[PDB]
Design a protein around this ligand. Structure first.
Ligand SMILES: CCCC(CCC)C(=O)N[C@@H]1Cc2ccc(S(N)(=O)=O)cc2C1
Ligand SMILES: [Zn+2]
Length: 259
């Protein structure tokens, strides 16, 4: 009944009770101190190959909405950078705020963006997602910040279908969506070992956070804010501020792909 969420009695500060790893040694998100981050020459060129990506459905899971992809074959993959091997795209989703001044999970020199896009990939050496989340290098999440300004044309198809998945549990066919339309020009990034930012908070993620944010219009993000945390027929609880705040960096160093 009393499941985790982002409210006063079931939010981020409560998660550790059911998920003790919430106070772990490599939790995410974290604040990215740009001056302390160090350029790493050992990093190989990052490769984002989404040309063959095949989306299948979009779902409101009561915490955010997921655009799911068919990962039964080697198509949309992420490799290079800090990664060893190939990681396959399985889904992407966002975290956003109730206001333009907040919403992102990672922060840059304490600056919060309006939202943050997470493209989730699993290490193919482990067979599938389930086995991957039992490994310290099982996942790679490409994070992209969203700022409010000009509209992002490639995001509109997502925005327009949200009306069909307003409440928790609802899903809708969502084929032929090209995630390449959500990527900024530059692939400059920061990377560090972390975790899932929502329960179960598993520490199996290599985070790759792009420095360049994408711009989305006020109208686009306002539609994100029309979604509901609640299910159909229940009192309306707007899906906003579904972000976890920065966690202790502890024994970690953030590396930059650029000088
Ligand atoms: C450990 C796997 C359990 C299942 C449960 C949902 C049916 C699951 O898919 N959880 C999802 C998987 C996933 C992937 C990335 C992130 S994030 N925010 O760090 O980018 C959060 C979560 C929670
Ligand atoms: Zn996320």
């Amino acid at each position: 009944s009393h499941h985790w969420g982002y409210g006063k009695h079931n939010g981020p500060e409560h998660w550790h009770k059911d998920f003790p790893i919430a106070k772990g040694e490599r939790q995410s998100p974290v604040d990215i101190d740009t001056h302390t981050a160090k350029y790493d020459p050992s990093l190989k060129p990052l490769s984002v190959s989404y040309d063959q990506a095949t989306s299948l459905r979009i779902l409101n899971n009561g915490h955010a909405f997921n655009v799911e992809f068919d990962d039964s074959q080697d198509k949309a993959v992420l490799k290079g950078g800090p990664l060893d091997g190939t990681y396959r795209l399985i889904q992407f989703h966002f975290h956003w705020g109730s206001l333009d001044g907040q919403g992102s999970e990672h922060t840059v020199d304490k600056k919060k963006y309006a939202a943050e896009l997470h493209l989730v990939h699993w290490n193919t050496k482990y067979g599938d997602f389930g086995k991957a989340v039992q490994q310290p290098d099982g996942l790679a999440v490409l994070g992209i910040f969203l700022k409010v300004g000009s509209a992002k044309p490639g995001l509109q198809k997502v925005v327009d279908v949200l009306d069909s998945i307003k409440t928790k549990g609802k899903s809708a066919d969502f084929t032929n969506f090209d995630p390449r339309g959500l990527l900024p020009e530059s692939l400059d990034y920061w990377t560090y070992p972390g975790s899932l930012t929502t329960p179960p908070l598993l520490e199996c993620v290599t985070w790759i956070v792009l420095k360049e944010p994408i711009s989305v219009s006020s109208e686009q993000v306002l539609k994100f804010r029309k979604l509901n945390f609640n299910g159909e027929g229940e009192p309306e609880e707007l899906m906003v501020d579904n972000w976890r705040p920065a966690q202790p960096l502890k024994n970690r160093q953030i590396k930059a792909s650029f000088k």
